């Protein structure tokens, strides 16, 4: 009952501008200090900006002047305007709420929105199905796409364990992700299995049914 | 910019044993006026956002397992894990809020120790839709095994790879292997293999195929 949701992330080219938004719910939004913390791809964390209950704004040295932290107590939203971005800004950005009601101590965090800043164009992905005992294993592969965030599911997100989605590996400005899933031999063909992939940036949702390979040549 | 520093970046504990992190400070975070320490601890299970663990350098956040404890003061703090479970796989950070430019430590990752396991291999030829659009890629899936150090492979020139973060559930790793190629070059050969060389396998474990079009 204490929810925080990042928004408006994605990608901009070096020098551009962004405005991340963080919608809150489940507390008197005004009587708490809030902050923003990014996590570099090095996986090191970095405090970015904080804002008290009295609208006082505080920033770290690397982002002064460029970033602007602001709150809207009427609609319970917290923004982070990010103008003129270096490649240091490439990171995963979280909004936080003060653990107490005195300071900016990062008690409750959102899920984090990804912000990659580079020149390469926004390219849609390519979802390729993979098909070949006692328990069979099907696969799915996502090649060629550039921002980072993609979300691969299985049968509209209904699949249990056995799934092992592997992290994306960029090479030559095209991320390449893959994933696995294991069921019983008596469980597959008879029951449909679809690999769903979401790529918000090109605004595409792709579904790929996993059908066995076909005895067709020439 | 007060600098935090954490000792052994990498660790390797087993279930039930003791764990202790150390977070050194370059400036006293203990205000005499309130006699309060301005330091916190965080846990970030891989793939998630960090969660507040310890704050005021001692208080456990409401809803934190009591097997965590935070002692130390001033410029040398510590986090104590008495009986470590398998759900505690992550990295741990220490924050200071004594002063702005709020800083986190470098972070302390910890591996867990389970019994050695064998990697289940599964190999997939390129999809029918990949060859038609140009290019083709072979994949073999290594799944569930304790030693994350294992070489897997006959000319491997343009390969990729990816690793899972060690399973918080069963303390195991997994591996992908994207043997990328083009359409024509895939048809002009026939030796497609994926072998494993493990901590349990110098007598190896393989999973290959002869090309579907033969």
């Amino acid at each position: 009952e204490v929810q925080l949701q990042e928004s408006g992330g994605g990608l901009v080219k070096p020098g551009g501008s962004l405005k991340l938004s963080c919608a809150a719910s489940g507390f008197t939004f005004s009587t708490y200090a809030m902050s923003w913390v990014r996590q570099t791809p090095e996986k090191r964390l970095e405090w970015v900006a904080s804002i008290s209950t009295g609208d006082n704004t505080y920033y770290t040295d690397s982002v002064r002047g460029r970033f602007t932290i602001s709150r809207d107590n009427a609609r319970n939203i917290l923004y982070l305007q990010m103008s003129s971005l270096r490649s240091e800004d490439t990171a995963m950005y979280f909004c936080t709420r003060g653990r107490g009601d005195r300071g900016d101590l990062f008690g409750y965090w959102g899920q984090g929105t990804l912000v990659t800043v580079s020149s390469a164009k926004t390219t849609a992905p390519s979802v390729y199905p993979l098909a070949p005992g006692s328990s069979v294993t099907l696969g799915c592969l996502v090649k060629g796409y550039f921002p980072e965030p993609v979300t691969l599911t299985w049968n509209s997100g209904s699949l249990s364990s056995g799934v092992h989605t592997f992290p994306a590996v960029l090479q030559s400005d095209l991320y390449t992700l893959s994933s696995s899933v294991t069921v019983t031999s008596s469980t597959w063909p008879s029951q449909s299995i679809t690999c769903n992939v979401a790529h918000p940036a090109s605004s595409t949702k792709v579904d790929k049914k996993i059908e066995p390979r076909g005895p067709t040549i020439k | 910019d007060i600098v935090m520093s954490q000792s052994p970046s990498s660790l390797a504990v087993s279930v039930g044993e003791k764990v202790t992190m150390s977070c050194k400070s370059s400036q006293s975070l203990l205000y005499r006026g309130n006699q309060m320490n301005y330091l916190a601890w965080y846990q970030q299970k891989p793939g998630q956002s960090p969660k507040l663990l310890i704050y005021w350098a001692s208080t456990r956040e409401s809803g934190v397992p009591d097997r965590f404890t935070g002692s130390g003061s001033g410029t040398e703090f510590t986090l104590t894990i008495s009986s470590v479970k398998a759900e505690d796989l992550t990295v741990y950070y220490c924050q200071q809020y004594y002063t702005y430019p709020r800083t986190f430590g470098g972070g302390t990752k910890l591996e867990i120790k389970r019994a050695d396991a064998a990697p289940t291999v599964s190999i997939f030829p390129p999809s029918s839709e990949q060859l038609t659009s140009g290019g083709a890629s072979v994949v073999c899936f290594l799944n569930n095994f304790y030693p994350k150090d294992i070489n897997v492979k006959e000319r491997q020139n343009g390969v990729l790879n990816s690793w899972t973060d060690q399973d918080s559930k069963d303390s195991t790793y997994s591996m992908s292997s994207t043997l990328t190629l083009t359409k024509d070059e895939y048809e002009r050969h026939n030796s497609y293999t994926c072998e494993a060389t493990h901590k349990t396998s110098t007598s190896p474990i393989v999973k290959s195929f002869n090309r579907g079009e033969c």
Partner: peptide, 6 residues
């Protein structure tokens, strides 16, 4: 002609 699917 698939050279062993299963």
């Amino acid at each position: 002609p698939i050279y062993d699917i299963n």
